[model samples]
Target: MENFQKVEKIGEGTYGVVYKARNKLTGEVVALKKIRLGVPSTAIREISLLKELNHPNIVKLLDVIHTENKLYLVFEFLHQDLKKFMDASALTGIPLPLIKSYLFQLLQGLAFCHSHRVLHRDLKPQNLLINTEGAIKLADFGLARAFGVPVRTYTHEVVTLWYRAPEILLGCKYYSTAVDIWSLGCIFAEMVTRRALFPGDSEIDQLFRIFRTLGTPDEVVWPGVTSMPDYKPSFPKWARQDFSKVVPPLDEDGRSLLSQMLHYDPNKRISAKAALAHPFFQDVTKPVPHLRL
Candidate 1:
């Protein structure tokens, strides 16, 4: 830890500032996250959850260095994030096959976390780290948690509003890994169109946007939809809009998988592994590639 030399400030995160650093011993570049102490217990939980995870698609935690009042996390440096790539036109207008490749890698990492009972409660384009070789790595587990035997109520203020799932927005206490799947769907759509699919201005606005496109969930579609803690505003019955119209440019396969992931009912949503097997990835020229660090 003491042998590392600070290079430059990389970016500011939700809870800390990140720096590009180099190890004096091996001359390897790494990202140093300086986390502020005395935040809350959730921050400690996030650190513990991240330390337990080990996957190619997940950001690797190289080391943890601490001073009296601050914690520094050493991680493998990544070139950019998905949001930056999309914004810079690097991934804009990319073919469906290439998009599928990225989505597959994302799901592969998510599946690994799901297997370990970890919920990446916050999932957005900015949270996805990308390297020069087109490898995708999931980062920013500050809101993530390891789900235990008996599920409990979690703070609804986790996922970014744009990528948050309907269940979370409705203030449902009992949620599962499917919440992350919904965010992934939103990310996929954003990558394809270079814009947000459901850009809601507020929580209510978000639900309306979702319902306008996919139709309002009913007792049959989402059994507990009406019983959520924050559930309000009963809209008149309406039919679902055509998926093709909502995402006109996306291919049938891509839309098909997206529909499953964005289902209103968390229990009915597609699993990360199942999403990887979806036909959207059938023509992916390159399978999910391993990340090199």
Candidate 2:
């Protein structure tokens, strides 16, 4: 910490405060995350997880500096996040090609993590960093964890509720990489509409919002739906509505892809790898992988 000069407080994170700082020797700009002491386990987890992640679409962890009582994490600086971009109204009517590009990059980053058996439980617009060259880097892997082997249950307190999948919402104990795919779908829908597709006031309300548009999950669709731990309340059954009508702004192809992503059953939802090949992105004049920074 002593080698770097703190420029300004950038923002507050889940565990600590973040600052924009510069290296004393190299004069390089960086984001310094100051983590509180005695939280060694989380600190170690973060460092170990980040150190293993190296991808163009994921935020790079440059180094870790430890003082007597605190931990300092040095990371590459990014101008702003997707939330900031949307707030500035810079994301309004963003061309389909650009939107596909961003989504593609996001999927690539996520696919890399999934391939490495890492789960970025918290995925949201605010956690997506956008650079000047139109590159989107996935940030804030504090909630990320390695999960591939069969585990009895995981704490449901993972992702922000909105981006969470139906199985998670239903309180399913055992989950897989499909959880992140559900989030990616929510994000993709938000990108096209320039607004959150489902913003529920409460847990029940959120599930209702999803069901009203996509229909309630039944034994045929989501077999174990009724057996979830926190399961409660049975609303009137609703059939799946046309997704095109729900997200009216998106074109037919876009809605088709979104529908597959936002499926009620996690087991049946499109995988991130398969989503990369979806027609919505393929039909774009300039597809996702071809976009250059």
Candidate 3:
């Protein structure tokens, strides 16, 4: 507390208030997440998971501080989030090259997380941090869980409605990393379109938006869909919309990767590693140390 000076309140995080701060000794910029409302399991989970993660596309947890009834998590400072970046370029639209780079880095980070058996249950534009070099780092792991331990009844109120997977919306408790893949797909579309692909006000509305765009699921498309806990018999059936029509700016290969990522069956959704090797990224160059800019 005494070693770092709080610059300003950045924003409220999922678990607590986040602030831009600087280290007094090292003059290093950092983000301090203050969890003062007693110690929550979410904070503990974030700390434990971040401590083990080491990847270029993942945010670094610098240090942790414990006080009377509060906990502070110090992390490497990032200039802005993906949401802000998109807004800045909303009019002009994000270039295809930049979009491809961002998605590649995002998938790289997700691949690392999934390989470690961690499920970042909450993934959204605001949770994706961006540096000046155009590197994308996955952040806000408060809802993340190490799936290797045991599958518990995870809270269905996980991802934001806009990015939530269909399986989760349908009351499927036994989910895996595929949920993150679905969110990635949403982010991918949002990146190209400069708007949320599925902007729904409620859970049901969100489901309808997704179904309207991707087609309503059935036994043939998604086996056992009717048996889902929240599957309604009266749900409307909609034909799948063309991806190229939805995101016209995206090329055919890009659209192909997006379709695979947004597959109806969670089991069929492309893994992060597999998505990285997709033809969409064939022309995209990998990140190099000096190439960062």
Candidate 4:
């Protein structure tokens, strides 16, 4: 722990504090997160799982420093996150090319995680770290099951209300990586629209908000959507909104990809791997794996 010197406090969360640090030997700048005592056990090994994941679009966990009854994590420093990126836009909208680039990077990271059977139970703009070079990387996997985290049987909930998948909201006991895709879908639309696609004020309202755009799900659209305990079949039947009209900033190909991801059926929602191959990113098919976040 003494080998690194703290430059400044970046932020604090469930863990202790994050600091901008300098490695005395290498003279390298790194982000350091000190683990607060008594966090879940999985939090301890989350670093190990992060170290196992190697992808251009995923943040790197450089090293773990353990001292007497304390742990410190070393990570590549990022300039900002997606939340700041969106907020910086201030409704004027992120540039078209930049939006496509960021979304592609986001999908690339997600594809790797899903392919490895690592579900990032929590996916949001804040978790998407953005480097000054315009590259984005996925970060913060405290809830990732790949790191010895248990799926608490108490409730099926995972992501925050705004970014949650419909199946999760409806109390589906079992779900797959499609949940991350759904959250990414929301994020994709939000990036272009400069606002939340479905900013539902409450849980029930969240479902209805999704229905307003994708229409209510039945056995045909979303198999077993009705049987879920909190499922409400009784509601104003909403016709699926034309996604292009909703996200007017995007071109037809872009709108098509976004719509498919936000599809009512989780099965119908395009997977991250498939989304990366979509025509929406044809001009810039592959993002350069140059910088680290």
Worst 10 residues of 2 by lDDT: 148-157
For each of the candidates, the C-alpha root-mean-square deviation to the true structure, in angstroms, is 5.0, 5.2, 4.7, 4.6
Ranking by TM-score: 3, 1, 2, 4
When 1 and 4 are scored with TM-score, the better candidate is 1
- What lDDT would each prediction earn against the true structure? 0.80, 0.75, 0.83, 0.78
Worst ten in a row by lDDT for model 3: 148-157
What is candidate 1's lDDT per residue for 1-293, written digit by digit as tens? 57779898977766567899999899999999886555346655566667879998999988766677877888988888777767776444655665788889899999999999888888998889987676789997745433321132221223247888999888877789999999999999888887898888888888888888888888899997888888765665558998888776887888899999999899899999888888777777644322333
How far in Å is the alpha carbon of 238 misplaced in model 2? 3.5
Q: lDDT per residue, candidate 4, 53-129, as tens digits?
A: 88889888898777777778888988887887788785567777778898888888899988987877678887888
Better of 2 and 3 by lDDT: 3
TM-score of decoy 4: 0.84
The runs of at least 3 residues in candidate 3 whose Cα sits more than 4 Å from the true structure, single-residue gaps closed, are 38-46, 144-159, 286-293
Off by over 4 Å in 1: 1-3, 38-46, 90-92, 144-159, 233-238, 287-293
- Deviation (Å) of 220 in candidate 3: 0.4
For candidate 2, write residues 1-293 as lDDT tens digits. Answer: 66889999987765567899999999999998886555457546766667779998999989877778877788999888787666565445566787888888888898898888877776888888888776889887735332221131122222246887778677776777888888888888887777787777787787888888788767788777777786664566889887667777888888888888877777788888888888777754433222213
In candidate 3, residue 205 scores what lDDT?
A: 98
* Residue 254 accuracy (lDDT) in model 2: 80
**Candidate 4 Cα errors over 4 Å, as ranges:** 14-16, 38-46, 66-69, 145-159, 234-236, 285-293
